[PDB]
Amino acid sequence: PIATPYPVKEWLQPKRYKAHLMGTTYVYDFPELFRQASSSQWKNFSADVKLTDDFFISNELIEDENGELTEVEREPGANAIGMVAFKITVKTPEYPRGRQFVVVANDITFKIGSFGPQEDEFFNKVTEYARKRGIPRIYLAANSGARIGMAEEIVPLFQVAWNDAANPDKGFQYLYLTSEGMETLKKFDKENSVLTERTVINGEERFVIKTIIGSEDGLGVECLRGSGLIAGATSRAYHDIFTITLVTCRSVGIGAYLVRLGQRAIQVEGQPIILTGAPAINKMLGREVYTSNLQLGGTQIMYNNGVSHLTAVDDLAGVEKIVEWMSYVPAKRNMPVPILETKDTWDRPVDFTPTNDETYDVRWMIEGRETESGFEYGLFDKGSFFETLSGWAKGVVVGRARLGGIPLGVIGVETRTVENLIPADPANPNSAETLIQEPGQVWHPNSAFKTAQAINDFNNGEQLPMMILANWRGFSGGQRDMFNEVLKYGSFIVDALVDYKQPIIIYIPPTGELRGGSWVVVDPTINADQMEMYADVNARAGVLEPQGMVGIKFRREKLLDTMNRLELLPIYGQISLQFADLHDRSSRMVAKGVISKELEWTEARRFFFWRLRRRLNEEYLIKRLSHQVGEASRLEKIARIRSWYPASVDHEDDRQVATWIEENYKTLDDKLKGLKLESFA
Amino acid sequence: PIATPYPVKEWLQPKRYKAHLMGTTYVYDFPELFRQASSSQWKNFSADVKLTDDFFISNELIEDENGELTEVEREPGANAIGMVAFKITVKTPEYPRGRQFVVVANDITFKIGSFGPQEDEFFNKVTEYARKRGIPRIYLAANSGARIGMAEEIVPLFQVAWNDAANPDKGFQYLYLTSEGMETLKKFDKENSVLTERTVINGEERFVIKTIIGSEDGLGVECLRGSGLIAGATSRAYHDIFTITLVTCRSVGIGAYLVRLGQRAIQVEGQPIILTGAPAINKMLGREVYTSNLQLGGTQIMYNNGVSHLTAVDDLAGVEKIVEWMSYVPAKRNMPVPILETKDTWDRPVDFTPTNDETYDVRWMIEGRETESGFEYGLFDKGSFFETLSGWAKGVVVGRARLGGIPLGVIGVETRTVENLIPADPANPNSAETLIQEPGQVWHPNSAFKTAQAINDFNNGEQLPMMILANWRGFSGGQRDMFNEVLKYGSFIVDALVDYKQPIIIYIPPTGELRGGSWVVVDPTINADQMEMYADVNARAGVLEPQGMVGIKFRREKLLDTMNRLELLPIYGQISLQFADLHDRSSRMVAKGVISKELEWTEARRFFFWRLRRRLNEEYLIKRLSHQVGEASRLEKIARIRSWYPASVDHEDDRQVATWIEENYKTLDDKLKGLKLESFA
């Protein structure tokens, strides 16, 4: 370009051009995209607020002399390795005074963003930097896998001992170096570049090379070690801090695993996530079966897979989604979940309501619906629903939302039948596109896996409370789903609930129900420390459904003896059905003690807001106590805390209890730090 | 039966006959099967030893007045509920003075082994009993799922308000009870058996029933709560003690999940593991698609699935396998792994050896092979290999074995191509039997899942050390395997290694190799506290295979410039191949520091035996220290321990170090309990 208004960036730094040819943003320009995305966040929150450039700070991070990371302000394009990181401090709606996180990214312009020892070491270091501070770690993937290479200093001077110099095409005994070669390597001190064994034949002394080590670093196994290091570090980071990855360009080998090990991933359209490229695979099969890497790791694979939680039209869209996703996450590990109250106040009834004889989108109960006669509010704050894994097992709906400002994870059941279309295997001339019918209100291995996955992603890193609008008839006991290990995935759900560290609410919606196999995997007894269950007065629950129940406890013989009240078998059968259905009522549930309370959908939002708020407050107190006697059970900890509540306070009153605790934080604090004399032993 | 030599058991206890008709052993007879199985164990160990009946004790367990479990010696068939348990103390070869464990079992003769509140409470109690003591919990499944029922006291006296008594077949307004009914229930105090609303029409007062609670317990939701309780308890037990389940008869609903939640399961042939029976499902689809429950949960499903770790021809076979499986497990949580040295001494070379140009069964390298010219010993003790999950992802071989007596978990790679035959979906007239070719030395989602699963089952409960004969070219990057989430399963492997608490050995066999994607997921840096890697001098490892490497770093243009040594392209290409292959040598691995040592297959058994023994000894010392300062890193803990070794002891000598530690346990002990003065704060 010639004669441009401002300095041609791609010229001041040719790398920028190189990255763009690659179809991805230049690593050093990414911080700017976060600023823009952060500005948009504010614009949406309060279109009035005037933002200052000091609301967003990006300090690059590099290793010093001691190999320790420090914030430096240098000029872009100076990175000595193919990995860069930035520490970002930004004021957001959830955290007006600022929140921090780190961004790690490959430099696609540096040796094609390969993963070499130095990059892996830097990556691991940055990951540990984040973990220590409890800060999120955002990773921007744009690489070509582990770095490779050969000992280039041996290729120009290696001699081969043939079967006969006359016929080179008759094989070769081995490979060696002449005294001249052994000397050349010595002139560069590159002697350790090869393991040889000096021997002489009917001529001169030929140094047989038994192993080539190479002079340059990052050629073979040393790169694979670095790969494992960061893979395990990432696996570890997922249980410690909020981890997320944006595939801004190709992500290969260790690159792909890193995406999955971070769990939460946003894939930019057209940017493949692959293990082995199409070319290499086509060669392995001989036939040209694959055309583009997008067939192996494109969004039609990973988004449909659940490896990719979301897709983005472009990098900036990816960054916006990342920032939006963080708006529900604590500034750092163990800090209170970020409360962000919007226009939609907690005090209001729930409008949209399901009908027993009318198809509906669960999302309407969650976020609400937009009808002609105005907007119908849902259970959660208007516009607060952030769906994820929306392309995988559509049988269940998972996302983040806010309840009067309180952020939480949500799981809803998709009642409408799912048309899961499975592509054909290009490597199998016989493979045929298959359509899988997935009935609603029913768990399948994929929807069960997704359910378990959502719970763990809510718990780990996000540390969010959760609500499940439980409405499943059970798992599929069919042959195919059983053969496909639906039991393993169903069990993952139990495992994930056992591990949950925040308040959990299980609630069966108005037209909802819970039967045999389903109730089991979501019962409050699984994790009595965090789980509570509620059933709408219009919900249903029982081991079996009416039809099945009557077919066991109400046979024909019992229909007759009962037929002595006033042929008329068809109508009398309905008497049986309704009879059984009279057992599956929330009232029985309360009488039996399997739920905390029966509720009314319209009043659900008001009830849960105060209930959740009350619990978050008591939880906070329970933790503050957990650090002293360390030998008291949750029961003993909450009992002592509730003994502090003023006698006139009704422990059953969520609003009162929450209101009192929030007015006496300091008072409660002094009390806690007054149990120091329980230093004891 | 009439005139029998001894008392007819099935008569003294008709239940025994009932259980047999059911095709399963009578719960109270099971203890006898463990005795017989335990006797066989000895017979195999030392055919000489004379056993006394006091080597096996079985004390039934029941709840007392306070609901606490105690050992009682009553007469069989007295169980008040449909769940029974026994505490077994038995002297075994691994533990001559005795080892203990509990056995929980449904009583198929008691209300068809349904799961009622009382049974779930007893089950949970027994599970917690085991966990507290760190003792294994064996579960014998024979049930019909959660217990169901209706309020039988309401079916004979409920009246229905029709549209018109003249035409009963015109619907009904609701259901009510007359003053007589409301009085009948009051005569039995069964008033809380129904929620009614007294109202009067143009006649008499009819009590409209809005909800039926029932008088008898265990009818609906209260059974589902109990189900969740034991499911979560089992999920928890798996990470605490050794859990195993034997499906001795049908296992339904909560029954099925309990099998999977315990993880380790042995399925008796013909005993289905199902969620919903065929009948109920056929009705749901209208068409008679399923004939037997074995199509839904038979061994051809669960054994092929991996839900069932093993199959057994009969109950006694199941019990024998259970006992055999426990012979590698500690008497209780945190006790040393049981050492059981047999005839096959540690001091001997490894006979069977793989050939680069000859198909072989990995099992031969593990346990050895039986040839005409005598027996060829393998790496592990002869006859010590106990394969599990042998019916699932045959691409990998997992089992338990002994190394000179030391029990450990083993993972080997199946090189021979697998012919995975997948049955057709009976519910899909289009479904067709499909054959899946699974190439050897390659990870597929199923073999990756199995690998991760084995690691966790080795770690949890079994607390065993582990060795992986790593020999994989990588994961399948194809479209189908990628679409099938091979990345998720590959990551499970990393996660499982991070969690491993015992010494781990990764070793690439003679003709074995490890490339790019594979090395990553098994590198020692993943868990440096427990992992160590070794490569046979005849092994190979690199980011890419020779073929792929040359196709990137050795193009035609480089072949020419190198062709100036002495058309002849085909033979010169081979020069490239061999050139690259000279980089993937164990020697480079050592030079680069990615492995601890290169080894010789024949000497592997000698080396690993002392290495493992040495490590188990140092680990023991590290733990003993971990309980005091609680702020020292593994590095600081082992360094202090190694500073105690006599100056003349060579820290690198596994045999010496192990031999010294074993001779100074008490001396080391005094030292440890001499750091009490490091009570400090």
Side-chain angles (χ1 to χ4, degrees), chain A residues 206-465:
Chain A
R206 313 204 287 185
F207 289 63
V208 185
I209 53 180
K210 304 196 75 67
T211 291
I212 301 185
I213 287 66
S215 168
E216 186 177 61
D217 197 21
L219 301 182
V221 301
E222 73 267 58
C223 290
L224 297 181
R225 150 166 279 226
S227 281
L229 171 61
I230 60 182
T234 303
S235 156
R236 256 175 289 256
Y238 170 73
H239 292 292
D240 211 9
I241 55 177
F242 177 81
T243 56
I244 193 155
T245 301
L246 172 67
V247 190
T248 179
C249 186
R250 179 181 64 258
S251 191
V252 199
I254 176 51
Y257 273 106
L258 285 180
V259 167
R260 174 57 191 183
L261 282 157
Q263 297 308 325
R264 288 168 298 250
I266 297 167
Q267 188 179 189
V268 174
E269 270 164 55
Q271 305 310 144
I273 297 171
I274 63 163
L275 267 34
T276 309
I281 300 180
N282 284 333
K283 193 175 180 183
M284 169 174 70
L285 284 57
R287 174 181 47 164
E288 228 67 7
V289 52
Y290 301 116
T291 309
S292 183
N293 284 324
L294 296 172
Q295 290 165 60
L296 304 176
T299 51
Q300 355 84 45
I301 297 298
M302 299 311 169
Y303 182 46
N304 298 46
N305 237 347
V307 169
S308 287
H309 283 55
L310 292 176
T311 66
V313 60
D314 54 41
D315 297 341
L316 184 61
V319 177
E320 294 176 353
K321 288 170 151 85
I322 284 178
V323 172
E324 185 178 355
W325 199 320
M326 297 179 64
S327 68
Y328 303 86
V329 185
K332 70 185 182 193
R333 172 175 59 242
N334 287 176
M335 270 208 241
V337 295
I339 297 175
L340 178 65
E341 299 160 307
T342 53
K343 274 50 58 188
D344 185 4
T345 177
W346 67 263
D347 191 4
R348 75 168 167 60
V350 180
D351 298 319
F352 179 81
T353 311
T355 300
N356 319 66
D357 311 311
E358 277 158 66
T359 293
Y360 71 92
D361 181 343
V362 67
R363 296 172 183 60
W364 300 338
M365 293 172 75
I366 294 170
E367 67 189 343
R369 183 171 55 167
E370 191 55 279
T371 85
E372 211 177 70
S373 64
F375 186 78
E376 296 189 347
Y377 296 80
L379 176 61
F380 300 102
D381 304 357
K382 174 181 170 61
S384 73
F385 192 57
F386 188 71
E387 178 162 7
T388 48
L389 288 177
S390 48
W392 178 28
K394 302 193 170 69
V396 286
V397 188
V398 325
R400 314 297 183 290
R402 299 198 171 76
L403 213 195
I406 306 171
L408 79 173
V410 178
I411 300 175
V413 188
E414 174 59 275
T415 55
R416 303 135 52 203
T417 296
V418 180
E419 301 286 317
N420 184 16
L421 200 67
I422 301 168
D425 187 8
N428 185 192
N430 307 57
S431 72
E433 170 183 295
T434 312
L435 175 144
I436 302 289
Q437 284 292 71
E438 310 187 311
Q441 287 175 262
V442 175
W443 262 311
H444 300 85
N446 68 346
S447 51
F449 195 179
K450 184 173 172 176
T451 299
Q453 188 71 247
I455 305 183
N456 290 310
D457 299 349
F458 283 168
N459 192 41
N460 293 289
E462 296 182 5
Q463 304 192 283
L464 284 176

Side-chain angles (χ1 to χ4, degrees), chain A residues 152 155-156 158 212-213 222 229 235-236 305 482-483 485 488-489 495 525-526 558 565 582 588, chain B residues 152 155-156 158 212-213 222 229 235-236 305 482-483 485 488-489 495 525-526 558 565 582 588:
Chain A
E152 293 304 317
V155 58
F158 82 88
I212 301 185
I213 287 66
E222 73 267 58
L229 171 61
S235 156
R236 256 175 289 256
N305 237 347
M482 218 64 164
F483 177 85
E485 307 162 58
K488 295 174 171 178
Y489 300 104
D495 291 344
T525 59
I526 285 171
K558 181 174 289 187
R565 291 302 200 297
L582 277 167
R588 190 170 186 284
Chain B
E152 293 304 317
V155 58
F158 82 88
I212 301 185
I213 287 66
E222 73 267 58
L229 171 61
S235 156
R236 256 175 289 256
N305 237 347
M482 218 64 164
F483 177 85
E485 307 162 58
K488 295 174 171 178
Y489 300 104
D495 291 344
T525 59
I526 285 171
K558 181 174 289 187
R565 291 302 200 297
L582 277 167
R588 190 170 186 284

Side-chain angles (χ1 to χ4, degrees), chain A residues 170-184:
Chain A
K170 290 306 302 73
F172 44 80
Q173 300 171 57
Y174 53 76
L175 290 172
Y176 60 94
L177 299 182
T178 71
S179 174
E180 292 196 3
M182 300 298 305
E183 197 55 57
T184 302

Side-chain angles (χ1 to χ4, degrees), chain B residues 545-588:
Chain B
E545 279 201 290
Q547 272 280 283
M549 171 52 101
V550 59
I552 320 294
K553 293 270 90 75
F554 216 102
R555 292 283 207 294
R556 278 63 189 65
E557 190 159 307
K558 181 174 289 187
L559 250 167
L560 309 177
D561 291 60
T562 306
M563 205 160 267
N564 297 305
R565 291 302 200 297
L566 212 173
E567 340 80 300
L568 37 59
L569 200 295
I571 179 61
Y572 254 70
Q574 290 295 142
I575 292 171
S576 295
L577 269 53
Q578 173 65 191
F579 183 70
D581 193 65
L582 277 167
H583 293 254
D584 326 323
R585 315 294 254 250
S586 68
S587 307
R588 190 170 186 284

Side-chain angles (χ1 to χ4, degrees), chain B residues 449-575:
Chain B
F449 195 179
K450 184 173 172 176
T451 299
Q453 188 71 247
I455 305 183
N456 290 310
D457 299 349
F458 283 168
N459 192 41
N460 293 289
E462 296 182 5
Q463 304 192 283
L464 284 176
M466 164 200 245
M467 179 182 291
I468 295 179
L469 280 329
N471 177 28
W472 286 279
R473 290 185 230 295
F475 294 84
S476 164
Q479 194 251 212
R480 203 179 104 276
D481 289 316
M482 218 64 164
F483 177 85
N484 283 325
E485 307 162 58
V486 76
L487 284 167
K488 295 174 171 178
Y489 300 104
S491 308
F492 283 173
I493 296 173
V494 178
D495 291 344
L497 291 178
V498 167
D499 196 52
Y500 221 81
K501 310 283 192 296
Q502 299 77 229
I504 298 181
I505 284 165
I506 307 298
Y507 177 32
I508 311 175
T511 67
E513 82 191 79
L514 207 57
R515 273 63 173 57
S518 285
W519 189 295
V520 183
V521 84
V522 186
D523 185 88
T525 59
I526 285 171
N527 182 168
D529 283 347
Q530 302 287 353
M531 296 174 73
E532 257 157 39
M533 192 170 176
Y534 305 79
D536 191 82
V537 285
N538 275 308
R540 287 292 186 290
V543 182
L544 291 162
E545 279 201 290
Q547 272 280 283
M549 171 52 101
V550 59
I552 320 294
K553 293 270 90 75
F554 216 102
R555 292 283 207 294
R556 278 63 189 65
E557 190 159 307
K558 181 174 289 187
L559 250 167
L560 309 177
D561 291 60
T562 306
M563 205 160 267
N564 297 305
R565 291 302 200 297
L566 212 173
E567 340 80 300
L568 37 59
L569 200 295
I571 179 61
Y572 254 70
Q574 290 295 142
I575 292 171

